[PDB]
């Protein structure tokens, strides 16, 4: 039982078989949750401004014993509202002020503070504030900041091998990416040598980075390699061999073991021999001397007597050296293992490549890399190396970086430091060597467990931190210099740097762009957009071919459908419906827990990494009553390879079928019957729809339109409402009932609708009320309908009656034939609004004025101008009429008798002014909606600028006096009630207030005090009303501050109604678009047996080649819905009794498989059925979920209820000949929408206009009547044709041949048609530009 009083007007039938478990989320959380936590006062400093301050705020003088701290920051209250900011043109922001503390301490005392200056806070910049819709109002225009998707800081063991190696060998490098600082890369060479690289610059040998960290050869060897004892005493030459530790090598000769020999000479090593050698205890066994020559020594050995450098570290043993080292040095020599099969040194080969053996020579190598010249002096190189990586305030990567680092190295601990560590470096190199030898797997960059998203709040925090670190330097300098002062804490705290940084980020940035404003869907999908480009990630749309593919981990996190089809395909994505952000920034998605067969209601959010372990079932899986599975074998996903599993192996199940698609692609009915390409194109073309005059709901939907319309913030929803008092075309007031009311307020909620305001796309934004007087309204119910919304549903388009048949070739390839009735009924008619502005721009000759005293103009031109010089509101203006009469002063009139005579005769002109008026651009026509004038402070011309001022003041007075009137009425009722039974009737109070006769009863009881208190309260209420009115008036008439040159600004808005015509581009929701080719009269259009003509004829030759069965299914379902609506309309027209209508509606609502229980006659009264039927008389609304839609059998059944042919076809007749078409045709109702590509804005023509000063060519792409561009391919075409004369003509006469253009024009006007080619001007420009270099060039004869 769903009441939903706003929805009970029109209930949309659902074909959803599956039961919904989790409700759709807020749909705009990603944009505003981050910003909310960015400016939230956190008791612990983790994120936001509290974390940005604690980073680098404590300022310590250069041994000046004077510090600077802060107590807390407070966010100021915004100066203007969002609507005020938008009408003005200023930015919406809030001042920031933080209480600081400057402490000065005397010398000769350890931390002995003598004075504190913690008494004044300093304002440092303004933060642009976010509205209720996850959008900013920067500079008066709504802007949205897109989230970024980059690689999380950490360590990545990418392969980077294959064809790019150019040697047929695989490589294994490793990169450590920090959040801030320099990058460190550990490559490999085809010579099996590793090299360290910083900032992708010239490489270095392997162990220089080790030697820089005070590591010597002995520790490096003993740490990276394992050393065997090699105890060879008394020339025994015996080896401690462990078959379990090392094996797999065939024995050469002279190999023995305990008891029998381990392996015979020349015999292959066997697992049985290894097992025997492991079972029997094996002591030191003797081997031939050949094993010593190839082996290398681990440490440096020194003779007992003297300390020569014999047997140097990392040196192969020699036969001659062996005798002397055994005689003099020692008997047991440390050595290595160095087996190719399962190991590889890869470092000892590099140690000899190192030119530096001491830390002294090693440390300067990195300085040589970093800086070419200026060799260090034992204080620069060490400082640079310590500050590059191991400094706290220069690397400081992240918590996420440390978390990834520890997870990728099998470390339990997660809380680490932003500084790197030597041990971390050795672990990284060891794991690189391990993966080279074969110990694990290389990483995957495309995996969504390796990429995290950055929202607006955290990038704003980063920009603020960058801006603050700059002013920290100035504060420190001013504190160090001239510290002998007791001034207020404004020594160097300048708000301009921080404010400039934040304004630069918010206003002009790659991720900050104008919001789309032509659809609620367009807005709500621009706010959920995810881009890979920007300050980071992929620097350009190039350099990627597998980055832009659909990775298997994109299941419930990003949409595989919605993405542009241009150069940046795959680099722009959209979140799924349920996708949420992890704690650190990764993407999650909800699942239901499955316990021992049953499916619980509890929801667990799993990131990309977690979902790879468990076995997750499928949403299209049958379920029992208790939560058991019907079939023993169910389809699941285990590690990226879906297959069949039993009911005892599953661990999770998907929430709903809408989980893998975004909000854009979940509005397409029958999405599973459309190809991926066509679904992508339909989703992309849905956003371009431009709203029409009358909104029309879709007869075939998916149920997501209600949620999209509500969450888009484009309607006017009722908060804490109980009943409606007064309804108007532009105002709604709701009398909140006492249940949802708290004391201290009148109890009136007022909503001011938005009427005909320009959008970012020059479209129209209009809100229309839905409720009537005395209509009870609940909480969360809509009250107004924004652009393209119908009773709270997203309605972008109209239900056209289509027919699928060829028609004399007027729908040849992608063209559409439209009936004239469509144009007559004003479907697809659109309203467009433009903005024109003019400025005064005072001069040294004198200020410019708008006085309408314009010279050299006729009285007809100035007919539409007011006294001040600006157009009347509502006047119609076309072409080049005058909008604002502006004049620019000229120089002083000369004493010359000619000008003196002109002044004496005519006067009032004196050539003082010139006609620089604002005129409508050519080919622009419309009617003026409203003007807006802005005058700077100190200028009080205000010719007619007071009219809008008075209008705003009166509107404020009207909307402010209502609450005071309600409070006064309540107080008067209280007085009338407290004077009851006191000998005074209510007649006197109704006649005259008299303050209840000032307690004329004089009972001396509490009544006198009550009347005195009520009089005092009334006086206080009146004073509050006057104060509020004066404050509103002062905020209204205060005046604006403009640019220094600008004196005043006048803005004019024009509204244009654009209708449908051939050339305009229509579309559907299934990736089918087209251009109107003809508008056919109603007589010719094909008609059926009842005389009703179809509205649009479409070509059936796109369906089989584009796989768009969704179109056909949609038309069949729409035909069924319209049949039901027509039957209901007929029963209403017959004025039949309520019982039969109710029974028919119930039978039409209960049809189909088990989907949803809804019944009339138990919740709907006798009256609600009337309005429900009157709402759904133009068609039965139907909702089919995305992958859970209606079935063909159910569509055929529904067609039978409205008495229609179940096949979907119908016989049609030709309108011009009256002869029946054989092969009956398919008619239906498709939801067609009009796109933003109109032929009115496409046509452009030119014969001769204005050229550029340089190169003398026509301007360009309609930039003030520009020309069109012949190109290299077009000249190739002309040359292939052999069109020498046409080519020469296009080269010279139509272009920069200055002396030839005029001659050709003259000859054409005279009727000659002859050409004088001459020479182009661009070639002369090229010759001059070449001669501007020291290169002589000229033309000979």
């Amino acid at each position: 039982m769903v009441y939903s009083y706003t929805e009970k007007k029109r209930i949309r039938k659902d074909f959803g078989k599956r039961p919904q478990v989790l409700d759709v989320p807020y749909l705009l959380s990603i944009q505003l949750d981050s910003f909310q936590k960015f400016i939230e006062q956190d008791p612990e400093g983790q994120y936001g401004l509290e974390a940005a301050f604690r980073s680098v705020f404590p300022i310590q003088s250069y041994s000046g014993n004077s510090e600077l701290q802060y107590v807390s920051y407070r966010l100021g209250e915004p100066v203007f509202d969002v609507q005020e900011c938008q009408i003005r043109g200023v930015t919406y922001s809030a001042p920031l002020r933080v209480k600081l503390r400057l402490v000065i301490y005397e010398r000769e005392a350890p931390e002995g503070t003598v004075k504190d200056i913690k008494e004044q806070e300093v304002y440092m910049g303004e933060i642009p504030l976010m509205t209720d819709n996850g959008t900013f109002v920067i500079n008066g225009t709504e802007r949205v900041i897109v989230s970024q998707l980059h690689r999380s800081p950490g360590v990545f063991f990418d392969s980077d091998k294959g064809k790019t190696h150019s040697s047929g060998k695989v490589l294994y490098n490793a990169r450590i990416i920090p959040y801030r600082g320099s990058w460190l890369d550990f490559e490999f060479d085809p010579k099996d040598n590793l090299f360290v690289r910083i900032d992708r610059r010239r490489k270095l040998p392997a162990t220089i980075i080790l030697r820089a960290l005070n590591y010597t050869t002995e520790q490096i060897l003993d740490l990276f390699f394992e050393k065997v004892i090699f105890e060879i005493r008394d020339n025994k030459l015996q080896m401690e061999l462990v078959p379990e530790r090392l094996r797999g090598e065939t024995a050469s000769f002279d190999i023995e073991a305990n008891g029998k020999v381990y392996v015979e000479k020349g015999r292959r090593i066997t697992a049985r021999h290894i097992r025997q050698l492991e079972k029997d205890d094996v002591k030191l066994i003797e081997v031939p001397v050949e094993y010593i020559a190839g082996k290398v020594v681990a440490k440096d050995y020194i003779d007992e007597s003297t300390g020569e450098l014999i047997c140097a570290a990392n040196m192969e043993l020699s036969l001659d050296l062996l005798a002397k080292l055994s005689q003099s040095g020692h008997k047991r020599i440390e050595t290595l293992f160095t087996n190719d099969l399962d190991h590889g040194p890869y470092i000892s080969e590099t140690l000899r490549v190192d030119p530096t053996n001491d830390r002294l020579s090693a440390l300067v190598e990195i300085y040589r890399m970093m800086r070419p010249g200026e060799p260090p002096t034992r204080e620069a190189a060490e400082s640079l190396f310590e500050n590059l990586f191991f400094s706290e305030d220069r690397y400081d990567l992240s918590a996420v970086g440390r978390m990834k680092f520890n997870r990728s190295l099998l470390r339990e601990e997660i809380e680490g430091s932003g500084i790197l560590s030597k041990d971390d470096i050795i672990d990284v190199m060891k794991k690189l060597i391990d993966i080279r030898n074969g110990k694990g797997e290389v990483d995957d960059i495309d995996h969504l467990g390796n990429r995290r998203i950055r929202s607006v709040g955290e990038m704003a925090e980063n920009q603020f931190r960058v801006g603050l670190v700059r002013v920290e330097r100035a504060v420190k300098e001013r504190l160090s210099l001239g510290d002998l002062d007791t001034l207020m804490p404004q020594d160097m705290i300048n708000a301009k740097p921080i404010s400039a940084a934040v304004k630069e980020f918010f206003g002009s940035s790659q991720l900050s762009q104008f919001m789309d404003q032509n659809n609620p869907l367009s807005e709500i999908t621009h706010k959920r957009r995810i881009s890979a480009l920007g300050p980071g990630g992929l620097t350009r749309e190039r350099a990627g071919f597998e980055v832009r593919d659909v990775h298997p981990t994109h299941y419930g996190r990003v949409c595989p459908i919605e993405t542009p089809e241009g150069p940046n395909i795959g680099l722009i994505n959209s979140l799924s419906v349920y996708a949420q952000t992890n704690e650190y920034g990764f993407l999650e998605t909800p699942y239901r827990k499955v316990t021992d067969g049953v499916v619980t209601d509890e929801i667990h959010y799993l990131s990309a990494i977690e979902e790879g372990n468990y076995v997750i079932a499928q949403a299209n899986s049958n379920l029992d009553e208790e939560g058991h599975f019907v079939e023993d074998l169910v389809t699941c996903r285990s590690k990226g390879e879906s297959s069949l599993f039993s009911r005892d192996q599953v661990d999770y199940m998907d929430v709903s079928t809408q989980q893998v698609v975004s909000v854009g692609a979940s509005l397409i009915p029958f999405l599973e019957h459309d190809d991926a390409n066509r679904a992508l194109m339909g989703a992309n073309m849905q956003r371009q729809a431009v709203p029409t005059l009358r909104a029309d709901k879709p007869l075939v939907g998916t149920g997501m339109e209600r949620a999209v319309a509500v969450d888009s913030g484009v309607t006017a929803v009722a908060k804490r409402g109980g009943v409606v008092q007064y309804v108007d075309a532009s105002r709604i007031v709701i009398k909140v009932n006492e249940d949802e009311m708290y004391p201290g307020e009148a109890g009136i909620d007022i909503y001011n609708l938005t009427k005909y305001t320009r959008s970012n796309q020059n479209t129209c934004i209009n809100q229309m009320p839905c409720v009537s007087l005395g209509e009870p309204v609940e909480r969360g119910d809509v009250l107004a309908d924004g652009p393209s919304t119908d009773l709270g549903e997203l309605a972008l388009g109209q239900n056209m009656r289509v027919a699928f048949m060829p028609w004399n070739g007027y729908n040849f390839e992608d063209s559409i034939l439209v009936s004239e009735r469509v144009v007559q009924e004003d479907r697809f008619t659109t309203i467009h609004i433009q903005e024109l502005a003019c400025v005064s721009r005072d001069t040294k000759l004198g200020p410019e004025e708008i006085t309408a005293d314009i010279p050299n103009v006729g009285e007809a031109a100035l007919s539409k101008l007011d006294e001040s010089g600006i157009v009347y509101i509502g006047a119609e203006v076309t072409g080049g009429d005058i909008l604002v009469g502006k004049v620019t002063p000229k120089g002083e009139t000369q004493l010359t008798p000619e000008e003196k005579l002109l002044r004496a005769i005519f006067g009032e002109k004196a050539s003082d002014v010139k006609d620089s008026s604002l005129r409508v651009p050519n080919g622009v026509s419309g009617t003026v909606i409203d003007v807006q004038v802005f005058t700077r402070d100190g200028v009080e011309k205000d010719k007619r600028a007071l009219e809008i001022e008075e209008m705003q003041l009166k509107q404020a007075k009207k909307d402010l006096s209502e609450e005071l009137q309600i409070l006064e009425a309540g107080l008067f009722s209280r007085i009338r009630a407290v004077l009851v039974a006191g000998g005074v009737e209510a007649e006197k109070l109704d006649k005259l207030p008299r303050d209840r006769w000032l307690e004329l009863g004089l009972t001396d009881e509490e009544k006198q005090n009550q009347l005195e208190q009520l009089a005092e309260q009334y006086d206080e209420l009146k004073h509050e009303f006057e104060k509020k009115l004066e404050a509103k008036r002062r905020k209204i008439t205060q005046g604006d501050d403009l640019a220094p040159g600008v004196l005043k600004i006048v803005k004019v808005y024009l509204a244009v109604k654009r209708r449908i015509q051939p050339g305009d581009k229509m579309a559907g929701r299934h990736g089918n678009k087209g251009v109107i080719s003809k508008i056919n009269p109603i007589e010719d259009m094909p008609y059926d047996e009842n005389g009703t003509p179809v509205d649009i004829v479409l070509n059936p030759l796109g369906v089989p080649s584009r796989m768009n069965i969704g179109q056909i299914l949609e038309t069949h379902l729409g035909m069924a819905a319209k049949g039901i609506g027509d039957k209901i309309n007929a029963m209403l027209k017959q004025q039949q009794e309520v019982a039969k209508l109710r029974e028919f509606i119930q039978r039409a609502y209960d049809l189909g498989a088990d989907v949803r229980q809804k019944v009339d006659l138990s919740t709907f009264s006798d009256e609600e059925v009337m309005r429900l039927a009157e709402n759904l008389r133009k068609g039965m609304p139907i909702a089919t979920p995305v992958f859970d839609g209606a079935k063909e059998a159910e569509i055929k059944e529904l067609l039978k209820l409205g008495d229609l042919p179940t096949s979907g076809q119908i016989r049609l007749y030709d309108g011009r000949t009256g002869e029946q078409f054989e092969r009956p045709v398919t008619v239906g109702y498709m939801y067609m929408l009009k796109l933003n590509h109109l032929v009115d804005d496409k046509m452009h023509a030119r014969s001769t206009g204005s050229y550029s000063l340089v190169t003398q060519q026509p301007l360009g792409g309609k930039a003030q009547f520009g020309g069109q561009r012949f190109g290299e391919m077009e000249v190739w075409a002309l040359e292939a044709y052999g069109a020498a004369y046409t080519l020469q003509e296009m080269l010279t006469v139509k272009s920069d041949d200055v002396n030839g253009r005029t001659k050709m024009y003259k000859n054409i006007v005279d009727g000659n048609h002859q050409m004088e080619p001459g020479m182009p001007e661009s070639f002369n420009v090229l010759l001059k530009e070449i001669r501007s270099l020291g290169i002589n060039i000229e033309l000979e004869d």
Binding site: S1250, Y1251, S1252, L1253, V1254, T1255, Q1256, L1259, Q1264, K1306
Partner: peptide, 22 residues
Amino acid sequence: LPVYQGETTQTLQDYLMWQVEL
């Protein structure tokens, strides 16, 4: 990009010469 190569304007003398040419 910085704005360059402005348009050419039609002054009185140029307009009168244009009309003389025809």
